[PDB]
Amino acid sequence: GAINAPAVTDDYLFSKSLAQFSSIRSGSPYADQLDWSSDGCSWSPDNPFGFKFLPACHRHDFGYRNYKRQARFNETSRLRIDDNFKSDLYHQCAGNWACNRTADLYYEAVRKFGASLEHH
Numbered sequence: 001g002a003i004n005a006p007a008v009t010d011d012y013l014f015s016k017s018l019a020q021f022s023s024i025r026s027g028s029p030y031a032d033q034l035d036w037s038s039d040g041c042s043w044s045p046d047n048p049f050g051f052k053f054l055p056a057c058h059r060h061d062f063g064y065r066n067y068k069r070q071a072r073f074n075e076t077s078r079l080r081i082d083d084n085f086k087s088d089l090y091h092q093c094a095g096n097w098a099c100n101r102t103a104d105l106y107y108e109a110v111r112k113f114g115a116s117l118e119h120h
Contacts, residue, residue: 005033009066013059013081018088022055025062035065043117044106049092049099053106056088060110064118082110 008030012021028036038061040054063081067073086107093099110117 001033003030003033005030005066006070006072009034009062009070013063014084018055018059018091021059021062025055025058035062035069037061037065039118041106043109043113043120047102049102052092052099053089053103056085056092056106059088060085061118064114078114079111082107082114085110 012024016024025036028034038058041050041057041060044050044053044057060081063084064073064078067077067081086103089103089106090100093103
């Protein structure tokens with residue numbers, strides 16, 4: 001109440017454009033049900049694309065943290081959220097080669113250490 005957190009979570013994660021996700025996030029709707037907190041890829045080094053990648057980081061944390069709250073987090077859903085993150089990063093890069101190479105490092109980091117990144 002008033003929403004079903006899993007359905008809304010999957011809409012915001014996998015259906016909404018990244019820009020509309022950021023818009024929605026900025027107003028923290030349903031904040032008593034949805035976890036809108038994010039570390040904004042604080043686990044990544046400063047780089048020329050890091051600011052551009054910030055909303056992708058927000059959406060990645062949104063996935064992990066709400067799937068965990070919903071008792072839906074497992075290696076399959078973690079991979080789905082990590083793959084969605086790679087898609088978001090590549091969208092931000094818009095074909096820039098150096099940007100894509102940096103996106104690949106972000107994806108590697110969450111695939112390998114996603115189970116422990118928030119812990120750190």
